[PDB]
Structure formats: C-alpha cells, structure tokens
Amino acid sequence: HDGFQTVKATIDWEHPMFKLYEKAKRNGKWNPADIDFSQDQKDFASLTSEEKISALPLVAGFSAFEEAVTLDILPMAHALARQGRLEDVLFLTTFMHDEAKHVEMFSRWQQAVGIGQMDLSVFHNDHYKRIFYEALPEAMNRLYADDSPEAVIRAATVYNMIVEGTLAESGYYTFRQIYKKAGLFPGLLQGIDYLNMDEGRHIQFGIYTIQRIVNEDERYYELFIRYMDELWPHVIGYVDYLTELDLLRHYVIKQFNLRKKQISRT
C-alpha cells in the first residue's frame, strides 16, 4: 500500500460508482430469509410430474447463473482495487453481496419445494457450459495477471453485458411472465422481482466500466462489439436447447441489441 485515499483526502463523493453504491445501500435491504415460500411448496406439490420437469430447466440455469457470478466478480474487484479505484470497489461490495442473496434465494426455493436433493446439472447443455463453466471464469480470472483495458472490457462484456444483461435478464423475464400468469410460485416471483431491481445496478456498473475505457480510444468500441458478437452463437445455442426441450428467443435478441446501444463510440 502506497497510502490510503481517505487518510490523504476523502472518497470522491461525486463519483458515479459512489452514487451507485449509495443507491445500492438504500435499495438493497431485502432478505431472502424473509420470503414466505409456504404457498410455493403447495403449488409445486400440486403440479403433475410432467408440469414439474417443465419448471426445472430454467431453475437449474438460475441457481448456476447466480452461484457463478457470486464467485466470478472477485477478480474484477481485485483489479479495480489495484488500480486505486476506491469508489468502484465500494460499489462492488454491494454487487457481491447482492449475488450472495440471489444464490441464497434460489437455494431456499429449491429446499422449500423439495427439489434440493435433486441434481439439476442435467439441464446444462454444451453452450451453457461454454459460457458459465468456461468463458466467464476465464475472462474474469485473466484480470489477476492482465488488467489491460482490453482485458477489463472483455470481462465486463462477458459478465455484465452477456451473462447478466442478455441471458439472465431474459430468463427471469420469461419465467416471471409464465408463472405470474398461472398464479404460481408467489415467493419465487417476489424473489425474482427483488433480484431484478438489484441487477439494474449491476448492469450500470458494466456500462460505466466499458464506456470509461471506450472513452480513451474508440478502437475499444470495435473490441466491445466484436466480443459481443463472438458470444452470440452460444447465447442462442442455449436458447435453442431449452426450446427443443419462443418468447425467450424474442426477448434475448432485443436485450442483446439494447446492450450494444448503451455503449457509445464517442
């Protein structure tokens, strides 16, 4: 440690990520342990065997979505801390704790409805593993040895713009539509609503991070777009697998294109 910013001076109170940190504390009070899952248990028990296995593929993708991102944000926090970006780090403590609650929430639902013992790994095909078992952890872990603008942009693209901002967002939108209409799983849907509010902040961090790097050299804009496209085939290839197993497809394309539009070449 060369010194400490709050000894030499203070926090930068006007920093965008300090402002996001403040919002996260105000809006991040929900506790998954407070959700009543008593009705979700009766709902799941009421389902036919065939109706049961219809919910499980998305729920397997969910618990893994959340456990992966809980573990995989730590190298980003390390890299930004090493660059002295104290406000970013403060914000990322709320990011990481949010992901812990999301892991917790889905595991509490599984336990409540009685599928905790079932191994749901069956429902991750080849493209799902390419992203969540491979390209996500490789891009994040890179940052321990290579924190170049190229490496940070790629980490933020894979994690924030694709995993959270394209795939997970579409999955939760889809799952909510379906079961809100059925009147089923009110505990889980309240959980997803809280989760979606959290993830609004997470995507803003990804946008800020990519944009501040693009703002130094528009070459990085073309890197951003290329990594986005590089990843699309596996994004859709997981959708197809679930399908083979419609609205999920349409919303995913929309979200992917929206994320590109939130980054400006200049």
Known binding-site residue numbers for Mn(2+): 66, 99, 102, 127, 164, 199, 202
In the window 15-34, what residues touch a copy of itself (CB under 8 A)?
A: 21-22, 25-26, 29, 31, 33
Binding window for Fe ion (CB under 5 A); candidates: 10-18, 31-39, 113-121, 202-210: 202-210
Rg of the chain over Cα atoms, rounded to whole angstroms, equals 19
Residues 6 or more apart in contact with residue 110 via CB below 8 angstroms? 59, 63, 116
Residue 235 CA to residue 68 CA, distance in Å, equals: 16
Tell me what percent of the chain is helix, strand and coil, each rounded to the nearest 5: 80, 0, 20
Q: Which helix (H) or strand (E) holds 217?
A: none
> Please, are residues 91 and 205 in contact by the beta-carbon 8 Å criterion?
yes
Q: Could you tell me if residue 158 is left (phi over 0), alpha (psi between -120 and 50 degrees) or otherwise beta?
A: alpha
How far apart are the C-alpha atoms of 174 and 177, rounded to whole Å? 5
Q: Does 56 bind a copy of itself (CB under 8 A)?
A: no
> 85, 101, 102, 259: which one contacts Mn ion (CB under 5 A)?
102
Positions in 211-240 near Fe ion (CB under 5 A): 237
> Under rule CB under 5 A, which residues in 138-177 are in contact with Fe ion?
164
Alpha carbons 247 and 195: distance in angstroms, whole number: 21
**Choices 109-117, 147-155, 168-176, 207-215; region in contact with a copy of itself by CB under 8 A:** 109-117
Q: Which does 154 bind (CB under 5 to 8 A by kind): Fe ion, Mn ion, a copy of itself, none?
A: none
Q: Tokens in use for 231? A: 């990843």
Of 124 and 202, CB closest to Fe ion: 202
Cα–Cα distances (Å) from 35 to 54, 136, 139, in that order, read 23, 30, 34
Characterise 57 by phi-psi region: left (phi > 0), alpha (psi -120 to 50), beta (else).
alpha
Q: Decide: helix, strand or coil at residue 127.
A: helix
Query: What is the closest distance, in whole angstroms, from the C-beta atom of residue 211 to Mn ion in the complex?
Result: 22
Interaction with a copy of itself in 171-200: which residues (CB under 8 A)? Answer: none
With binding defined as CB under 5 A, does residue 108 bind Mn ion?
Answer: no
Q: Is 83 in the site for a copy of itself (CB under 8 A)?
A: no
Q: Report the binding-site residues for Fe(3+).
A: 66, 99, 102, 127, 159, 164, 199, 202
237 binds, among a copy of itself, Fe ion, Mn ion, none (CB under 5 to 8 A by kind): Fe ion
Binding site for Fe ion (CB under 5 A): 164, 199, 202, 237
* Site residues, a copy of itself (CB under 8 A): 1, 3-11, 13, 21-22, 25-26, 29, 31, 33, 60, 63-64, 66-68, 70-71, 74-75, 77-78, 81, 86, 89-90, 93-94, 96-97, 99-100, 103-104, 106-107, 110-111, 116-117, 119-121, 124, 132-133, 137, 144
